[PDB]
Design a protein around this ligand. Structure first.
Ligand SMILES: [Mg+2]
Ligand SMILES: [Zn+2]
Ligand SMILES: [Zn+2]
Lengths: 196, 900
DNA sequence: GATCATATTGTCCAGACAGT
DNA sequence: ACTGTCTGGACTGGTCGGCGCTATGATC
RNA sequence: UCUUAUUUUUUUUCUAUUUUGCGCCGACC
């Protein structure tokens, strides 16, 4: 339970128990938000309002993928140095610490995790479809794909409040250029004046 | 001889049956060695079948592509609970005593339940209800009625974990884990006489077989192995699961033979149980699914059987077929409704197998002598013994000289051949019809326009499929049952489905309108174009500038049969006085003089007397879909072949009329004078003033709540009603200021294409944009867009567009229209899936219903669903506007026939 | 250098179930 | 006998085209 | 000056006749 509270209950506030008390403060600001709507002091915020919506770009997804790949590379290097120390011993390990660290690194282990996620489009954490094949039908298709925004919601789900156009999409999301079928509404394109 | 599967009996495979059916024993958790050969005793053993072409199966001696495959068996070290029966096992564990093994019911209760089982019959619901009642009654008894031994409650943990609630000597209640061996031992004590009480067959569904002691490994053919492009064999998910199962079983056997402690044995038993549970069903709740080394979860037998991609739906109920084509469709009014445009490339590929007889020997010999590269030719030849030879250049003459009676020739698609024409999705039985092959040298399919509404197909890149029946029985069934002209009337509503649309309606109106006259050359040209057997021109109606002129009604009268008389009102009715006068004149005499009818003839009242169109203009009410009275009468009173000929001729005639007379739309069709614009602006100002007054009244508190409603939605409904009245007034003004000379107005009024609101939206206003049945509200706080003040409930700030398409919308109004269009598109894209699911559910619920020879609809079991279909035994397709017999039409037609 | 055993165990509707 | 809760299943069909993945840390 | 063991005939050739699966993305009806 201590580990669960430390690593799951609001991890953005930290993982040390010292900030645990501060997490309670972040709980309090939640409770008020629950209480006021239960008492009419405040109204319910719009989930589709773009003030409460962020746009994860290629940089953030690349950072997450690089973090996963670097963590796996770190664990691989730790296993490599452990195996080398267990086999050769302390004499060969500490006689040249520059060569020992360099030889215990497999760069491709990192690389084949990054580009593969950029090949199949599958991202760590269950996110998929992040990277797609660039459309080269004409000049318009490539720009549309480079200015394309998707949603994590399922395509088969009827999202009446999410697929429909919002008033905050003025100047940020194109009101007309949307795909047909199940992709309608959930897939949008950035407006010409949209700035991120 | 030949035999068919009369019935299928289901049951649980006994370990003895699994051992007997197995051609090999599998112990090596491997498929292929380094060189690629199968390993003896492995899963890829030749005794279970062969996939690679070089190898030959050990069990049956057949090569790849013909060996059916043979099952194997794996002797598990310890019994494993089958997950699919696991819950059922728990039910038995709650029904039978732990010591005696008999059910926990008295002898009198057992006998009474036997009589109840025998009495009720074979309905499944009653059997399940009785089984549930027996289980509930037996599960609450803690003392065995036969032995008196105490019983303990059993707790079932998903998926295959059983807990027995036992009591120690100190009275403490604890949980004992029931191992699968103990469960099987308990199940073995149940006699065969108590099995029907538990819903188990004594000789087919013994409970001890519900615990797996021998695992049947599938044949090699059912889980094939392929070689990738990189030279590395790609194993199946089932093969990997079986490899894991064999490895765990071998480890358990080695540990058992080594005298491992109990901690080892139960842990390996749990691992083997998990592996077998995932192998039976990888999507079992409460366990992690089995995953590949790449992180991909595997799909086992349960996922192979169930789902949209499963065997039942993706391979058994529906499957890919041979001798089928699929390509784009393009219009072709020049062909009949019975004909389909087949490309030459498609025709030379799809082949009809025709047996050589005494009357088609010369034609098939010529087809063989032409070869596959010459049309009309042939591709394959099958001898009477049954060897198929492909026709090349070398043997083309040799096979032709060897042709005799009894041979089969797969000839190319010829004119008059019957083929199926289907468009997906197939929502109704009219979505596929049997057409006649017409071979044209282009690339696309060609389908006649009146057949498009049955297919719900336009020509904006629509893709359609074509199926060629092979057997003579299938061709005859397609020709007789699913022919196009046999399905003109839709059985859904008993009205015309194969009917003229768009340009057909417009050309009919242009031809049959008042003042429409044609010259002799034009009349001859349209008669030749429509393919009518008019040898001599009729008497001209009038002479203009010394030349004869023929009325369009006279030309239209030649299509109708000479003994046809029907009168009705069409959609072009706006002066009811003339229609009432015509109805009264018809009512008195019942045979009005043609001169008398023509004196007061009105385009709004269609009247055909003895096949002569005396009055009225042709529109959607004549031969349009779901509205054509004339086509409906022609089909019912003159057959389908005459109806098909009439439809083809009238479509060609209307196409000729609309082609040469000139039909067009321009930017001045929506043009309005300054008076109309001023009136529309006055209506706009009045509507905004009323909305502002309503808002002020709501703010000052004197607005009255609706009964059961508060201020907000009452004010919203009042504003929406005011905007709707304003839109109706604007549309009325636009209709008033747009005459019948407008081609767009002609199309809207005649029902050809579009509506009056469409012309109103392009000329007067766009109305109010609404989302989910209410005004637009999603956006910022108190407003939709930031260009309006917060808290503004005015018309312009809530989606009421004042200008039309011709005048151009403001950016805010453009955004509001975008929200409306997005809402509509999302509505259709959501509705289609729900409608398809409901259609599938209804079809699967009513697939087996059929009218018997006595007029009764019964299920396959025998229960009479209906003692008479529709309570009168009348086909809805042959019904007259949902009625049994149209007594009015029959009486009128018979009276006219006897009077004439 | 070339091989080899092992490789972890989103919503909505309907039926069954403790709780009062 | 009611009532809220836990668990389980399905989420229209078809087609065109592409992209990409399905080993590895010891052993002699 | 001494026990408790048995005994026999009826089978033939140098050899042979058209890559799945998983998952993603996009588009059309
Ligand atoms: Mg279309
Ligand atoms: Zn075989
Ligand atoms: Zn008993």
């Amino acid at each position: 339970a201590e580990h669960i509270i430390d690593n799951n209950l609001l991890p953005h506030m930290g993982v040390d128990p010292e900030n645990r008390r501060a997490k309670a403060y972040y709980l309090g600001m939640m409770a008020l938000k629950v209480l006021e709507l239960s008492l009419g002091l405040r109204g319910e915020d719009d989930k589709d309002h773009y003030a409460n919506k962020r746009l994860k770009l290629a940089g953030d997804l690349l950072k997450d993928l690089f973090r996963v790949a670097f963590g796996q590379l770190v664990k691989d290097m730790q296993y490599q140095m452990t195996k080398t120390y267990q086999r050769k011993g302390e004499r060969y390990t500490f006689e040249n610490i520059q060569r020992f660290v360099r030889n215990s690194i497999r760069p491709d282990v990192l690389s084949e995790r990054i580009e593969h996620a950029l090949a199949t489009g599958s991202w760590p954490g269950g996110r998929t479809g992040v990277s797609q094949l660039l459309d080269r039908t004409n000049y318009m298709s490539t720009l549309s794909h480079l200015r394309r925004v998707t949603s994590p919601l399922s395509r088969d789900q009827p999202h009446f409040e999410a697929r429909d156009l919002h008033g905050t999409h003025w100047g940020r999301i194109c009101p007309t250029e949307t795909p047909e079928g199940p992709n309608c509404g959930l897939v949008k394109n950035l407006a010409l004046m949209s700035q991120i | 001889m030949k035999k068919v599967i009369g019935s299928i009996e289901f049951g649980i495979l006994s370990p003895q049956e699994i051992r007997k059916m197995s051609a090999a024993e599998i112990t090596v958790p491997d498929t292929y060695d380094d060189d690629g050969y199968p390993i003896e005793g492995g899963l890829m053993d030749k005794r279970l079948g062969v996939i690679d072409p070089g190898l030959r199966c050990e069990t049956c001696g057949a090569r790849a592509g013909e060996c059916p495959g043979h099952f194997g068996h794996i002797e598990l070290a310890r019994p494993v609970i089958h997950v699919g029966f696991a819950k059922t096992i728990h039910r038995v564990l709650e029904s039978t005593c732990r010591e005696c093994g008999r059910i926990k019911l008295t002898d009198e209760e057992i006998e009474e339940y036997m009589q109840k089982f025998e009495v009720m019959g074979d309905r499944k619901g009653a059997v399940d209800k009785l089984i549930k009642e027996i289980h509930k009654k037996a599960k609450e008894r803690m003392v065995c009625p036969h032995c008196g031994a105490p019983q303990f409650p059993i707790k079932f943990e998903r998926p295959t974990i059983y807990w027995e609630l036992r009591k120690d000597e100190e009275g403490n209640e604890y949980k004992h884990r029931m191992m699968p061996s103990e469960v099987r031992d308990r199940l073995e004590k149940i006699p065969d006489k108590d099995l029907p009480l538990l819903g188990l067959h004594p000789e087919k569904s013994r409970p001890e077989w519900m615990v797996l002691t021998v695992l049947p490994v599938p044949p090699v053919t059912m889980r094939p192995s392929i070689t990738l492009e990189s030279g590395i064999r790609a194993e199946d998910d089932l093969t990997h699961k079986l490899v894991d199962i064999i490895r765990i079983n071998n480890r358990l056997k080695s540990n058992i033979e080594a005298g491992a402690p109990q901690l080892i044995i139960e842990d390996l038993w749990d691992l083997l149980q998990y592996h077998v549970t995932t192998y039976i069903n990888n999507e079992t709740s409460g366990v992690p699914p089995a995953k590949h080394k790449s992180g991909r979860p595997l799909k086992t037998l349960a996922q192979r059987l169930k789902g949209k991609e499963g065997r039942f739906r993706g391979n058994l109920s529906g499957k890919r077929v041979n001798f089928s084509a699929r390509t784009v469709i393009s219009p072709d009014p020049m062909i009949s409704i019975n004909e389909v445009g087949v490309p030459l490339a498609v025709a030379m590929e799809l082949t009809v197998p025709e047996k050589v007889t005494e009357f088609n020997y010369e034609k098939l010999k010529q087809r063989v002598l032409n070869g596959p590269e010459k049309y009309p030719g042939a591709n394959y030849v099958i001898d009477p013994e049954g060897r198929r030879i492909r026709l090349m250049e070398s043997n083309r003459e040799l096979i032709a000289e060897k042709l005799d009676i009894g041979w089969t020739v797969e000839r190319h698609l010829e004119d008059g051949d019957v083929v199926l024409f289907n468009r997906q999705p197939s929502l109704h039985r009219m979505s596929i019809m049997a057409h006649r092959v017409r071979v044209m040298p282009y690339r696309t399919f060609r389908l006649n326009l009146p057949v498009c509404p049955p297919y719900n197909a336009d020509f904006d890149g629509d893709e359609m499929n074509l199926h060629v029946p092979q057997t003579e029985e299938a061709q005859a069934e397609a020709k007789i049952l699913m022919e196009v002209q046999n399905h003109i009337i839709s059985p859904r509503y008993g009205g015309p489905l194969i009917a003229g649309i768009q340009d057909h309606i417009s050309g009919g109106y242009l031809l049959t309108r008042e003042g429409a006259y044609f010259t002799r050359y034009e009349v001859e040209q349209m008669l030749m174009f429509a393919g009518m057997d008019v040898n001599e021109l009729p008497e001209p109606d009038k002479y203009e500038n010394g030349e004869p002129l023929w009325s369009g009604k006279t030309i239209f009268s030649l299509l109708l049969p000479d003994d046809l008389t029907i009168w009705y009102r069409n959609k072009l009715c706006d002066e009811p006085e003339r229609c009432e006068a015509l109805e009264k004149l018809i009512e008195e005499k019942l045979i009005p003089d043609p001169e008398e009818v023509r004196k007061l003839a009105y385009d709004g009242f269609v009247y055909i007397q003895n096949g002569k169109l005396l009055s009225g203009a042709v529109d959607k009410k004549a031969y349009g879909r779901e509205d054509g009275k004339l086509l409906d009468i022609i089909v019912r009173e003159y057959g389908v072949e005459r109806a098909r000929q009439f439809l083809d001729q009238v479509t060609k005639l209307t196409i000729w009329v609309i082609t040469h007379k000139g039909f067009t739309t321009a930017i001045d069709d929506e043009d309005l004078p300054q008076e109309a614009i001023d009136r529309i602006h006055e209506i706009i100002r009045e509507a905004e003033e009323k909305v502002q007054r309503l808002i002020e009244a709501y703010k000052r508190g004197e607005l009255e709540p609706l009964p059961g409603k508060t201020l907000e939605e009452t004010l919203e409904s009042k504003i929406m009603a005011v905007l709707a009245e304003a839109r109706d007034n604007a549309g009325k003004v636009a209709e008033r200021y747009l005459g019948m000379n407008n081609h767009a107005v002609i199309m809207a009024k005649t029902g050809a294409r579009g509506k009056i609101l469409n012309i109103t939206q392009m000329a007067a206003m766009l109305g109010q944009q609404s989302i989910r049945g209410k005004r637009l509200y999603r956006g910022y706080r108190g407003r939709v867009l930031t260009h309006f003040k917060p808290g503004d409930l005015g018309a312009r700030a809530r989606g009421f567009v004042t200008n039309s398409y011709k005048s151009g919308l403001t950016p805010q109004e453009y955004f509001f229209h975008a929200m409306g269009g997005r809402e509509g598109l999302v509505d259709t894209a959501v509705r289609t899936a729900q409608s398809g699911y409901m259609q599938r559910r209804l079809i699967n619920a009513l697939q087996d219903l059929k009218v018997d020879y006595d007029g009764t609809v019964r299920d396959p079991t025998g229960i009479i669903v209906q003692f008479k279909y529709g309570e009168d035994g009348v086909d809805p397709m042959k019904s007259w506007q949902g009625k049994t017999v149209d007594v009015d039409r029959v009486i009128v037609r018979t009276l006219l026939k006897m009077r004439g």
